[PDB]
Amino acid sequence: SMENFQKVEKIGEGTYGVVYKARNKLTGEVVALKKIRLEGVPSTAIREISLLKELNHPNIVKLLDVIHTENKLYLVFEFLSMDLKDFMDASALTGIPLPLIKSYLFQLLQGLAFCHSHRVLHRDLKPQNLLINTEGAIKLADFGLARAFGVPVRTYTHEVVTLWYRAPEILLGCKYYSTAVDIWSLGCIFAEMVTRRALFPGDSEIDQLFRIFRTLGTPDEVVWPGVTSMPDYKPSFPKWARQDFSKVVPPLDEDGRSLLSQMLHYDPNKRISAKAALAHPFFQDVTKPVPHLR
Amino acid sequence: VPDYHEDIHTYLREMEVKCKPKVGYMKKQPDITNSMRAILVDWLVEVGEEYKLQNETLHLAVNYIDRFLSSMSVLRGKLQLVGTAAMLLASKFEEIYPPEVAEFVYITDDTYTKKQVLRMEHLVLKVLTFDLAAPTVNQFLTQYFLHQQPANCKVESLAMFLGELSLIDADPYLKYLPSVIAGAAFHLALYTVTGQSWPESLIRKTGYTLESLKPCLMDLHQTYLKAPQHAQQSIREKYKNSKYHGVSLLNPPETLNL
Ligand SMILES: NS(=O)(=O)c1ccc(Nc2nc(OCC3CCCCC3)c3nc[nH]c3n2)cc1
Numbered sequence: 001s002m003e004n005f006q007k008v009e010k011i012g013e014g015t016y017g018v019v020y021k022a023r024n025k026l027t028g029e030v031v032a033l034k035k036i037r038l039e040g041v042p043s044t045a046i047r048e049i050s051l052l053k054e055l056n057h058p059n060i061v062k063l064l065d066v067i068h069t070e071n072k073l074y075l076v077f078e079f080l081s082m083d084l085k086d087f088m089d090a091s092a093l094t095g096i097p098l099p100l101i102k103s104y105l106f107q108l109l110q111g112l113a114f115c116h117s118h119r120v121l122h123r124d125l126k127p128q129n130l131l132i133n134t135e136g137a138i139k140l141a142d143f144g145l146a147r148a149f150g151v152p153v154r155t156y157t158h159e160v161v162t163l164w165y166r167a168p169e170i171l172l173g174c175k176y177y178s179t180a181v182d183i184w185s186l187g188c189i190f191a192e193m194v195t196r197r198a199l200f201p202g203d204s205e206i207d208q209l210f211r212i213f214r215t216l217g218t219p220d221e222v223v224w225p226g227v228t229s230m231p232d233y234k235p236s237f238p239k240w241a242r243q244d245f246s247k248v249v250p251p252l253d254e255d256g257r258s259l260l261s262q263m264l265h266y267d268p269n270k271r272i273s274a275k276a277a278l279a280h281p282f283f284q285d286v287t288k289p290v291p292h293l294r
Numbered sequence: 295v296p297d298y299h300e301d302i303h304t305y306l307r308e309m310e311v312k313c314k315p316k317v318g319y320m321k322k323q324p325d326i327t328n329s330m331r332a333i334l335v336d337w338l339v340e341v342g343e344e345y346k347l348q349n350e351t352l353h354l355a356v357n358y359i360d361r362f363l364s365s366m367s368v369l370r371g372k373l374q375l376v377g378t379a380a381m382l383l384a385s386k387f388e389e390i391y392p393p394e395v396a397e398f399v400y401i402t403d404d405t406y407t408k409k410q411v412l413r414m415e416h417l418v419l420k421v422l423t424f425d426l427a428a429p430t431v432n433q434f435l436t437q438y439f440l441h442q443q444p445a446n447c448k449v450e451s452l453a454m455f456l457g458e459l460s461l462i463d464a465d466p467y468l469k470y471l472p473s474v475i476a477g478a479a480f481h482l483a484l485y486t487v488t489g490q491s492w493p494e495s496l497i498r499k500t501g502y503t504l505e506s507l508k509p510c511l512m513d514l515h516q517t518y519l520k521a522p523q524h525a526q527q528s529i530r531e532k533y534k535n536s537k538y539h540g541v542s543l544l545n546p547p548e549t550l551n552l
Binding site: 039040041042043046047049050051053054066068116117118119148150151152154155156157178179273275276 | 296297298299301302303305306348350382383386387390392394395412415416419420423424425426427433436437440
């Protein structure tokens with residue numbers, strides 16, 4: 001039972017379930033609680049649990065326990081203070097220091113690299129799914145859309161990734177998609193950390209493709225082999241020109257720009273990977289600054 | 295070749311050892327036997343053919359079954375309920391569109407109720423401590439396939455047939471890890487169709503040689519030979535289809551030479 005847990009407040013709903021802030025009456029430990037109502041145990045919870053028990057990493061949210069009672073299923077998590085989106089909104093007047101964007105991106109990639117090294121796709125990387133403590137760490141959360149993939153991949157659920165962060169290969173309906181979809185999402189978030197507005201906030205699939213095309217250029221066979229043969233490619237697509245990356249994220253380093261242009265490469269194969277990304281010269285001076293938050 | 299192939303292979307190799315069931319669990323099962331297990335596994339191949347399920351789902355289900363039976367005694371009349379929960383859970387894990395619970399109650403022919411199937415799903419989950427991302431023979435074969443020079447669809451189908459035959463007979467195949475069952479399966483397939491052998495590149499990747507795979511390769515060679523006489527025929531039937539290039543109809547070689 002949850003005799004030992006006192007709910008403090010609700011904090012959100014994501015993918016499935018509901019997350020409460022709660023407190024361990026006996027230990028004093030503040031936790032997060034994901035509650036599931038019980039068609040059997042949801043496919044989403046089955047995946048989140050088994051995979052998160054496998055993934056133990058400082059940058060991946062720790063699952064502490066799994067409790068029953070019925071007809072409920074409680075997941076018990078390490079608590080964290082704030083999601084990235086709220087933090088970005090708190091930093092509206094003052095900005096987010098570059099050494100902190102750097103640290104955060106560095107940490108995120110580590111955690112993504114761990115995932116991918118353990119045949120795991122996140123598939124829902126967005127700022128509401130990234131948590132931060134006061135000590136300076138950022139962690140990946142909400143593994144509801146996650147799935148264990150195989151080598152090589154076969155076709156998976158097409159629904160995936162919330163719109164603003166969805167990779168072009170999903171949007172254009174490629175039959176296979178891989179680790180490159182998590183990099184894409186991470187690239188958008190990188191830009192968003194710098195500009196504090198979402199990079200491509202579309203309202204429909206076509207809107208999104210167009211917003212991406214206006215920023216990165218409408219892709220052709222030269223920049224992305226096989227693109228004009230994709231299921232949702234339309235020849236009637238407006239042919240926009242590519243613009244300088246210096247205008248896409250104006251405050252950014254030459255090395256920031258390099259890193260970003262690689263995380264947002266059209267071709268999923270050409271798109272840099274998390275593992276490789278850690279070696280990028282952007283991170284040469286990387287440290288671990290605290291966020292200074294309340 | 296991506297940047298995670300070696301990391302994933304390494305991790306999968308680590309994980310098969312931890313996900314391994316107990317080898318002599320059937321000797322500890324008072325009411326169930328190897329033959330009864332053969333019947334259950336064969337039935338799940340039927341179920342997977344009915345609902346067009348991925349082969350991965352099938353291997354996962356069998357892994358779950360064996361791991362559950364390594365710690366929980368079951369009577370003969372309930373083995374099929376365990377089997378049904380496994381298949382369900384495997385579906386929820388692996389499939390884009392799993393079948394409803396209702397559809398699972400139907401294929402048991404109203405032996406068990408919905409409430410029974412649901413409560414068993416929990417029990418399995420709990421007994422397996424929710425750890426369901428087990429490596430399978432199938433997961434290794436698909437990696438091994440990448441080492442074909444060049445690709446041959448008949449080799450892949452035959453490999454997966456042989457690997458699927460290992461699922462039926464706990465004696466002997468329980469004493470082998472999936473990565474090894476897959477090496478045997480891949481070589482046997484490859485030698486039958488093209489007359490080629492385990493590739494040196496796969497030696498570099500896996501550490502396995504024909505000498506090291508031989509014990510399993512000998513056992514699998516026998517299964518393949520006795521397959522048309524085998525009491526369970528569902529897998530053979532499945533692999534007559536053009537989807538699998540009619541590989542079950544092929545003539546097995548009589549000697550391997552090693
Ligand atoms: N709004 S906010 O910025 O004030 C704030 C944010 C998140 C948290 N804390 C927290 N949240 C989780 O899920 C949050 C959940 C909400 C819905 C979207 C998906 C993620 C967790 N899962 C494990 N640990 C968790 N810790 C505290 C404050």
